[PDB]
């Protein structure tokens, strides 16, 4: 077994093709399925796995009541092969109300945060054993990516934040070797608030597109130098911005450098990736709510401030259906590294009627160099058919 | 590991012996089991797997209502070891309302079609990653075999159709290497309508027996030259024809060349294979409905037009019981390549109105050079005992 | 990997120690568990598996009604790791209302009989593929061991019967190499009726203790010469006889040669094995019904006609509780071959009329050279707590 | 594969970080989950497993009624990967109402005790086969650790007791090689009553911290010399004692040598381990009941009699929530051997009378050389939401 280097060029991308869907909520109405949120996907060299934060209960279960809450002690990281729904045989990998996972070519690293809001613990589990832990540095909800970390040549990197969700916070980039923290770098650059980074290998370095929860509806970028541990940060150049909420395309802005101060407060986890001067990105179709999901390329969207010429739009989830968090993962092919993404399809309380639970399913798409058509792949559950 | 070549002679066939049965619908009445249709079987070098298109729901589940519909975004390809029923731990391999799968000796290829009727996408997944995709070419339900594809020396072939189900359509034969489409050939020859091909290795080439949904109740043949990608097509010579609907045995015809224009409209997926001048074939026992299932050899049925001398009949499913789609798969033995088949046993709507769902179980038989008796192996569920 | 030879001495045996129990029926009252009967155990070189004939239904399921019947088309052979109860993820290995399985050191052989009573088919599946089949030779319920077959140096042997259960029948011993029948020997010797043999390796040969359903309450022995395929048969010498029904211990007889003509009609599958002049055997505690289970050694019980000197009695299931079929399996240790056995614990109809189903659990014990105490390990389900 | 030697220094310990939680009871209210008690954790060289004694039933099952009883024939040892809850696919490894398991680097050993109170049998199963057995030596509930045994250089050791729970008993230390008992040593030293030992490798020897059920609320130590099989015993020096019940912290004593005669009767399984002159230990927060769980270091707690200076306290389960048994396990890291522990979280009768069953979930923590915060990770089930 060799460490992954991800040392191939990025695949040609013309858009995205359907990859996986789990139908979690539909199945929940006729079977014992975990209540989850904050899912993601990560692949070992051979196969892909779906992850999510359980709520310590199945859906058709009185304990599913009031699972809207983000942090309870019973949350655990679930891990199944991609497309295997979270049934009762699912392994709970660690205790976590915030997580990141990645495979270095040899073994899995899991970063699992749990405990009190003001004094959380992050556990670092590698190759099936606890190797390290760190306590809260800002005493205000130590937290991490909710998507895959990235490892190059045996060094894995993960972005963590501690502090205010509505002001200056303390973001740190950890470097981890076989589960052991070997270095911690403070966030540097012009990103002013960084949450829930979606990171990808860009050999020899790592690049993250994140969520600004404070003043930006444009998405921050964090660049991680894997050689010298230096950090840089800015914002996606695209004038078509990626956060929710955001201004309408009529009036939205990004200058590549600063939070745009356009409905900056709050946000949603999302992703983008560069191809030369262009950017491929996803966002909710609604500028207001976590409804619908679309992808497109913005011509000059990586390099030209305020660029707004999009092309190659695809609807993933139509605007009449719920989405949620989304994130990137990378898959090594024969000659190139492909970029894929998942969309969390949130169902239940409070937005929807009848039910007392909050859960999600997932849909997953992967970059293609080929051709494709159109469709919409929403959660598909009928709220009227669900146990409450 | 080496690529499969299937470079052994076809096994001696005296008939077929029982191989597998999943009892899906019986189990559905007391357990959480997927609603499915369009099942098939395919084996890696070591063991066989059962596949089917899920309906994104279990049977004992309000979402099972109105699962008669062929295409919804929630359909996914399920894959279990043969004889493991589709329980909640089943892996959903891809998003698909039409599919084909095969193993090349090294890894699995899945061809998965989903999306809008007028603009579908086929994804090509190999060794657990998306390698290619193609969009609809005729804007009219791009679709494929619903049974195993065939790979020789690292090149896999699959037949796909796009266009009318009741007139001239656009059928293409794809050649795929490690998930990448390397060549596409148009259908050629005298077959006038080709659907749902059941294909098998006939080293060094591939041979398919398909469904003519337009003018033929005789089954089309598609011959695929794996060296130069050339295509030929015609019809099974046997005067005992394989489609449903069809004329009675007394008045049925085939001239090997043309659709017989005998109750040609509509059809059912099925199979046949050659042994010299003779043909082994299955069909529904009913000439009108998907009821019963029988196999037999037609003497001269491969090479003599309108041959009707049958022998070695076996009842697989008696005529009082429901069948459905059927297809071929091939299994490599020590010295020869064996031919096996599965039968889909459809239950529920529209025919059975006590329940609101549509699903199936499977029964599977394999070629034998030995001896055997008689029986009948239907679905076996009591419709009155079923959750509705 | 090498073929198993079983070429080690039989382990020292002082009695039996508890090995496994599945609690199938207790679990059935709170979970989806297969209805079964005719279970057995067989181990590959690494680990042991439990097998049984499913009834194509779970217990808490309307299809469980009237599962008293021995032969329906929906019966399939189930196979799990030993101690894993027959849940919905259990693999159905083949279609079978009578079966035998064994591992030759390289792969599994399964002998699976199904179809019409007067014209059954036995399928021979090896290394995951159908290799051979045979039809009924006496047109009267072709049938086999319901316990493990035995393979030495790549040749597996299995005993099959076709014909009357209450008169002269046609018993044959098959020799099978990688799934292919290479020789068939007729029964020879003085055993007059042979059913449901429990066989074990006695290098270089195989020895079976069976059920005489006709005139004997003493158990037949079948000796299989693996070199020249010759067959011999007689009866266990022990005056303490192993069948049910039987006479009481005071009046029972065996002359080693002939059926004893003591309540000879009917019987139950069981086992015994030799150690020099002595025999280790199990039997139901009741002489009338399949109630209770005991093991003991009979001193001179292998070599001395009508020997009744028992020692080392152990209660496996107390006489207040139901038993059923029992059979032998063999397990290779470091320096010796151990003998183990399972007991089928039958619940439901016809004896227990509150419920409409018939099913079983299992308990398993293995030979020990050590020491042990006493107990009773019955099924343990409360019939009043069961779904009916 | 090589035998484990555990020949690395003990890892630096600053405290404990969260590792695993199974949420068994919460899940039981919406899924088929085993009723258990007496859980533990043990890891092979790659992966950790959770074990527990089943009650031969699921929770939502009428058979769960009156599972307070410790010993029934239906109890079996369950084994899943750590964090996989005990679903219906769980393997029952052996018949056991008392158990210990460990991996020697090559294979699993299981020590499983079952049968009559006055005449129990312990089975020794290694590498999937029964290798040895021993009967009761004191005719009074032969019993063992309820946590992992320890193997060094292919020799595994386990502590067993037979005799009174409230007076002088007969404790023996067994030495087992590939499942075969090679030596038995009587308890020696000043420990006067030894139950339910929590043992760990301290190369080249093994050290156990146990439960005195008779005169001590201070915990006994058993030291096992793996070279000459000699045994020593005493009591943990710490004046902060580990048993429940016990005196309050102000009035509790230990002299390292004798049971303290302070509320000595009864107890609970627990653990401690040495670091130089200091001791790391866990205990219930309540001095009266199995409620809450805390860990801390006692400075001089290993070497100084009646030492009471604690530091590095952590709450694992707050005092408002139920705990139960706890035990140690050891995990080999790159350069050191880590110490971890599990806590049994008991729910139901007799304390909670709304329900009729008794079961548990688990939470698991591992030693860390890093930093951590605070929290509480109780069972989390709402008794009012449970099937009774
Ligand atoms: C079968 O499947 C294939 C493959 O999926 C389909 O082909 C794809 O079809 C897509 C839709 O036509 C196409 O993407 C489009 O590319 C064009 C550039 O050629 C781009 O303009 C499109 O983006 C606009 O339209 C979409 C809706 O389609 C809007 O959501 C989006 O916001 C864009 O609209 C904005 O810009 C327009 C142009 O300036 C304005 O006219 C419009 O009012 C709107 O303006 C707002 O935003 C501006 C900033 O962007 C701002 O200045 C202004 O003030 C407003 O605020 C879209 O990306 C794919 O390229 C194509 N794929 C391929 C490979 O060919 C095919 O159609 C399917 N066929 C069927 C029958 O199903
Ligand atoms: C135990 O098990 C074994 C193994 O399963 C059994 O042996 C098998 O038995 C099969 C049935 O006899 C046998 O297959 C038959 O082979 C003969 C040739 O030898 C063939 O004629 C049979 O086909 C006719 O009969 C079946 C029903 O059995 C019909 O479904 C079929 O359509 C055929 O009937 C048509 O042709 C006949 C002859 O011309 C006409 O009499 C009949 O009316 C009908 O005519 C219509 O169709 C014609 C076109 O074909 C058309 O010209 C006309 O106008 C009408 O429309 C069948 O294939 C197996 O070979 C044999 N297997 C082996 C290895 O021996 C055994 O019986 C079992 N034993 C018991 C006691 O259960
Ligand atoms: C703790 O556990 C250990 C290990 O499990 C226990 O030790 C075991 O204890 C067993 C019972 O004592 C013992 O087996 C016995 O061995 C003697 C020979 O030494 C043998 O005679 C015993 O067999 C008789 O008794 C059993 C009931 O125990 C009957 O079921 C059986 O049919 C036998 O009864 C017949 O023979 C008797 C003597 O000849 C007659 O009195 C009786 O009426 C009956 O006669 C009928 O059968 C005859 C043919 O057999 C026939 O001629 C006559 O006309 C009648 O029809 C039994 O096998 C184990 O050897 C021993 N194990 C070890 C390793 O020591 C220990 O007791 C446990 N302790 C506690 C307190 O739980
Ligand atoms: C964020 O998380 C971090 C990491 O978890 C937190 O840091 C940890 O904080 C712990 C609590 O302060 C600390 O452990 C403590 O260490 C001190 C020594 O420095 C030790 O004295 C503490 O033990 C006492 O207090 C705990 C409750 O905290 C009691 O349960 C315990 O019994 C001890 O109290 C007894 O002794 C005291 C002093 O002698 C008495 O005042 C008290 O009444 C009580 O006396 C009884 O027992 C005596 C025998 O011991 C007996 O003589 C007398 O008669 C009475 O019966 C505790 O171990 C950790 O070291 C620290 N961890 C690290 C790595 O720094 C941090 O606080 C969190 N952040 C925030 C803001 O909360
Ligand atoms: C959920 O819990 C709330 C109490 O917070 C209660 O009012 C409501 O009835 C519960 N829902 C159900 C379905 O029991
Ligand atoms: C299925 O849906 C139809 C149309 O809404 C309805 O009439 C029928 O009652 C439904 N079936 C069940 C069993 O709910
Ligand atoms: C089982 O079937 C019999 C015969 O049809 C019937 O009398 C009985 O009520 C059935 N049992 C149940 C529980 O439905
Ligand atoms: C449990 O058994 C007891 C004694 O038979 C009975 O009083 C009680 O009702 C049972 N509990 C349930 C929930 O059936
Ligand atoms: Ca924002
Ligand atoms: Ca047709
Ligand atoms: Ca008899
Ligand atoms: Ca005590």
GROMACS .gro file of C-alpha atoms in nm, chain A residues 2-11 103-105 150-154 200-206 226 330-339:
model
   36
    2UNK     CA    1   0.123   0.347  -0.099
    3UNK     CA    2   0.017   0.692   0.022
    4UNK     CA    3  -0.213   0.885  -0.213
    5UNK     CA    4  -0.050   1.184  -0.382
    6UNK     CA    5  -0.336   1.287  -0.614
    7UNK     CA    6  -0.054   1.372  -0.856
    8UNK     CA    7  -0.256   1.365  -1.178
    9UNK     CA    8  -0.417   1.661  -1.364
   10UNK     CA    9  -0.781   1.748  -1.298
   11UNK     CA   10  -1.013   1.567  -1.541
  103UNK     CA   11  -0.831   0.811   0.342
  104UNK     CA   12  -0.457   0.864   0.294
  105UNK     CA   13  -0.410   0.563   0.065
  150UNK     CA   14  -0.750   1.569   0.199
  151UNK     CA   15  -0.423   1.375   0.232
  152UNK     CA   16  -0.110   1.406   0.016
  153UNK     CA   17   0.198   1.187   0.073
  154UNK     CA   18   0.077   1.076   0.417
  200UNK     CA   19  -0.991   1.913  -0.267
  201UNK     CA   20  -0.635   1.812  -0.368
  202UNK     CA   21  -0.463   2.043  -0.615
  203UNK     CA   22  -0.125   1.874  -0.616
  204UNK     CA   23   0.096   1.950  -0.442
  205UNK     CA   24  -0.140   2.162  -0.231
  206UNK     CA   25  -0.498   2.162  -0.100
  226UNK     CA   26   0.138   2.132   0.216
  330UNK     CA   27  -1.232   1.384  -0.543
  331UNK     CA   28  -1.190   1.049  -0.719
  332UNK     CA   29  -0.869   0.925  -0.882
  333UNK     CA   30  -0.912   0.791  -1.234
  334UNK     CA   31  -0.665   0.626  -1.471
  335UNK     CA   32  -0.510   0.952  -1.595
  336UNK     CA   33  -0.685   1.233  -1.406
  337UNK     CA   34  -0.846   1.338  -1.076
  338UNK     CA   35  -1.222   1.382  -1.104
  339UNK     CA   36  -1.437   1.618  -0.897
   0.00000   0.00000   0.00000
